[PDB]
Design goal:
The structure is cut from a larger assembly and holds chains A, B, C, D and E. Chain B is α+β, with helices and mostly antiparallel strands. Helices cover 28% and strands 28% of the residues of chain B. In chain E, 40% of the residues lie in helices and 10% in strands. The chains are: A alpha+beta, B alpha+beta, C alpha+beta, D alpha+beta, E mainly alpha. Chain E binds 2 RNA strands through α2. The PDB classes it as ribosome.
Chain lengths: 63, 158, 107, 369, 62
RNA sequence: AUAACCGCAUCAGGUCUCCAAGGUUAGUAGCCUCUGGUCGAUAGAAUAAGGUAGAUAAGGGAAGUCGGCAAAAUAGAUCCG
RNA sequence: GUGGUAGUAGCAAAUAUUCAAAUGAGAACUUUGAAGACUGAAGUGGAGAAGGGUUCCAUGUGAACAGCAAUUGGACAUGGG
């Protein structure tokens, strides 16, 4: 119904799914999948991954 | 050379295997399968060739009745109402070679090869073979062959 | 009542050689190609060419190719050793496997 | 000597021995008791297990989750309609129950008839051919027996697994008891079902506790640890996935209570599992009041190991098993049971993002041919 | 067997046994050749040949 | 000398000497290769429990144990200290 | 001298074999080719000592021996060195 969205990849999370990492200060980073979470452990950012919707947006693709 | 039985001949023929290098307990099993059909009658020779060639292909199987411990249970032995069975190939070779010679002996006496029936097959044990197996601690242990003697006697039916 | 037939296959080797040990991949390729040909054409004797063998072992024994094209000829048997047919199996050199069906091969 | 530290037992002795049962479908055992008072109805069903997916519903319990939106795991069970065939009387003797006379229908399909052969492809398919000419020449001699005698009556029904996407065709035959009033009218209920498909909505309803019979999924010969739930031994000569001490010296014998190695899974086995949705194969099954988007309860890429395009039922064994359901032995009211169900959202998405395949096509856009 | 011939070729070719090559379709003629003198004639005919050594480039090192 | 010696044997053991290629590297370390040598060690099919060796484990981090036993973690070079 | 145990324990270290043709009564195992591997110059390579004593080389083969097989062999036989 209502559908919160991923912090990393900007995808949609239909309910009963994913995971909400709360940071040290308390920004609640939502994820879809272990792909997202374990790149947030390694501290690789969305902007450098080509498949992500962020790199898509910044390099004149989509919209 | 000294058979166990002796048709007044004319109507019967025989072959003997003096001391074959096979396992006694495995040849014992093949020979019990060949001896009769599923009924009480004595089995035809054309059937027992057609059997022993198929046991080498592993399509029919030999039921091990007497010497069981510890033979694995196969579906092909349902044929004989018996759970355990096995495909002794080298044993089927020497028994096929003997029946081959037993039909050759019939061809001199000029009777129907097509009508022949297995009157009596029997396996005896034979004198042992000696070898050495070496055990830990310097012990020496015997390793021994068990060759066997195979009689076959055939005749005409009718 | 069998008759001599030549026809073509592609064998999914990745499918055949699944869950199988790393020092038995390329051998147990050629057992299953022999058993495939043997089951397909109903024939005991199955010769396979050295250029099929060579292609399969190109990988090195564990990295076997995913697909192979293979054409399989049942042929009449000199004085015959029991059975009067023999199968024989050949490599087909092929650039891509995109819609290639189990076709017949004309002479 | 006593034990040292008195722990409870590993595993129940209730279920023993732990061996694979002789049956692929669940045999029912113990139908519910007869009220000569209700109308006549069937008290059981058969269906095939598919796969399970979560659903969102609003709780109506003062819990802290009152008026909140809870995700719940939910099994889909494929249930195409069971065709009634026969009927069976049962005399009550001092030994037990005892079958007096089975009557059968005129015309069975090849779906039902496969059950009676182990080799269908060979046979000339003779089953109920002498019976069918005997039926046209019917059985109101033998039905009069069941009205006169016989405390208990059971309809013989059977499945339709050609309609399922199992490669089956063979179809399970099953006795189902009839619990209403008057022994004549039980037979009149059964007679008029002959060669009629009974649907699932005839039996079960939304918001109902069901007792689920089946067989557990097999794991072969498993050891003590997995099979009985036993402590793993410390890092031990010989090995450490096993019990150390079987037994005391006396009795000079191993007791049956000690746990051993052997079979695990394929055991015949629940009660109080709520039905959320009865569906229809005839679109908008997974559609609700809230979401209003056109769906079927097949997820994308099938249920893994596929489709479902029949009647089904959700609720709170392995895939492609024949489950049986049962109507609960007493009609019970526990607040937890007798609950208002409200489904907001059924999921029909390896790791799926999108609910429908046209939703995926919108996201990726014009792809390359 | 041939056996003797692969031994004797290896002496006269001054090459490792690994190196000697013997023609498959003249296995009749080679089995006739028992002597050293006979195997010299099979070198002239090119039925027994020495293989080249396996390729070992210095390109990538340089 | 993993089959011509000694160990009862064609035994995973033992038994003095010489010559000693390329790449990586401090290096006759480890890893891969050329010349020379070898494929000798019963096979085929299935992939249960239990073993033998080998890997990996969310959160906690010796609470296990007689005892950190076993395994992890550290590791080279340069500059500072 | 012979049993039961029993056609049972077992034949699982040293990364590995495969395809064809020839030979033969018979080929998973002999030879030849083609592929694929290992040894990885303080080598399983090329030479000596101690110890062995004809095992060296060729041609031939019915057994037994080479813990499966064997057309092979440090086995067996007749020659030579």
């Amino acid at each position: 119904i209502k559908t919160d969205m991923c912090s990393f990849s900007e995808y949609r999370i239909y309910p009963g799914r994913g995971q909400r990492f709360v940071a040290k200060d308390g920004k609640v980073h939502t994820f879809i999948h272990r792909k997202e979470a374990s790149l947030f452990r390694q501290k690789i950012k969305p902007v450098k991954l080509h498949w992500t919707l962020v790199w898509r947006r910044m390099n004149k693709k989509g919209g | 050379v000294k058979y166990a039985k002796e048709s007044n001949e004319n109507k019967c023929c025989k072959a003997f295997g003096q001391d074959l290098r096979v396992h006694f307990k495995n040849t014992h099993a093949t020979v019990q399968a060949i001896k009769k059909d599923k009924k009480g009658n004595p089995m035809k020779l054309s059937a027992a060739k057609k059997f022993l060639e198929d046991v080498m292909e592993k399509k029919r199987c030999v039921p091990f009745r007497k010497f069981t411990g510890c033979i694995g249970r196969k579906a092909q032995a349902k044929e004989f109402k018996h759970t355990q069975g096995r495909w002794p190939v080298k044993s089927c070779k020497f028994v096929l070679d003997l029946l081959r010679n037993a039909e050759s002996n019939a061809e001199m006496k000029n009777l129907d090869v097509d009508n022949l029936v297995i009157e009596h097959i029997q396996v005896n044990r034979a004198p042992k073979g000696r070898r050495r197996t070496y055990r830990a601690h310097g012990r020496i242990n015997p390793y021994m062959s068990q060759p066997c003697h195979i009689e076959v006697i055939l005749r005409e039916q009718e | 009542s069998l008759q001599p037939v030549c026809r073509d296959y592609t064998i999914h080797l990745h499918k055949l050689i699944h869950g199988i040990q790393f020092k038995k991949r390329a051998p147990r390729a050629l057992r299953e190609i022999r058993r495939f040909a043997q089951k397909t054409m109903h024939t005991k004797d199955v010769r396979i060419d050295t250029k099929l063998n060579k292609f399969i072992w190109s990988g090195g024994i564990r990295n076997v190719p995913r697909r192979v094209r293979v054409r399989i000829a049942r042929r009449r048997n000199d004085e015959d050793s029991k059975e009067k047919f023999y199968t024989l199996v050949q490599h087909v050199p092929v650039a891509s496997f995109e819609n290639l069906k189990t076709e017949y091969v004309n002479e | 000597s006593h034990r040292k530290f008195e722990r409870p037992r590993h595993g129940s002795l209730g279920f023993l021995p732990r061996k694979r049962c002789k049956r692929h479908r669940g045999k029912v055992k113990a139908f519910p008791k007869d009220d000569p008072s209700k109308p006549p109805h069937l008290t059981a069903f058969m269906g095939y297990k598919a796969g399970m997916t979560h659903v969102v519903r609003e709780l109506d319990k003062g819990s802290k989750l009152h008026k909140k939106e809870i995700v719940e795991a939910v099994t889909v069970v494929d249930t195409p309609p069971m065709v009634c065939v026969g009927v069976v009387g049962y005399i009550e003797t001092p030994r037990g129950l005892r079958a007096l006379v089975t009557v059968w229908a005129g015309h069975l399909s090849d779906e039902c008839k496969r059950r009676f052969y182990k080799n269908w492809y060979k046979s000339k398919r003779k089953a109920f051919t002498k019976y069918a000419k005997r039926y046209g020449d019917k059985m109101e001699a033998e039905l009069t027996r069941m009205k006169n005698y016989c405390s208990v009556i059971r309809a013989i029904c059977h499945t339709q697994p050609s309609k399922t996407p199992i490669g089956s065709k063979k179809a399970h035959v099953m006795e189902i008891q009839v619990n209403g009033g008057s022994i004549a009218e039980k037979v009149d209920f059964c007679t008029k079902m002959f060669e009629t498909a009974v649907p699932v909505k005839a039996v079960f309803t939304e918001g109902e506790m069901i007792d689920v019979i089946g067989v557990t999924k097999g794991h072969g010969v498993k050891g003590v640890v997995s099979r009985w739930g036993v402590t793993r031994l410390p890092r031990t000569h010989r090995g450490l996935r096993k019990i150390a001490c079987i037994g005391a010296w006396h009795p000079a014998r191993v007791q049956f209570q000690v746990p051993r190695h052997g079979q695990k899974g394929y055991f015949h086995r629940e009660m109080n599992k709520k039905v959320y949705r009865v569906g229809n194969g005839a679109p908008r099954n997974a559609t609700t009041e809230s979401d209003l988007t056109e769906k079927r309860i097949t997820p994308m890429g099938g249920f893994p190991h596929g489709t479902v395009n029949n009647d089904f039922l959700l609720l709170k064994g392995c895939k492609k098993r024949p489950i049986t359901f049962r109507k609960t032995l007493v009609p019970r009211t526990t607040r937890r049971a007798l609950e208002p169900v409200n489904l907001k959202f059924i999921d029909t998405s390896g790791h799926g993002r999108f609910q429908t395949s046209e939703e995926k096509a919108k996201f990726y856009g014009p792809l390359k041919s | 067997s041939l056996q003797l011939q692969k031994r004797l070729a290896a002496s006269i070719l001054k090459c490792g046994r690994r190196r000697v090559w013997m023609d498959p379709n003249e296995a009749s003629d080679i089995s006739m050749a028992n002597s050293r003198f006979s195997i010299r004639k099979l070198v002239k005919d090119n039925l027994i040949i020495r293989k080249a050594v396996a390729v070992h480039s210095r390109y990538r090192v340089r």
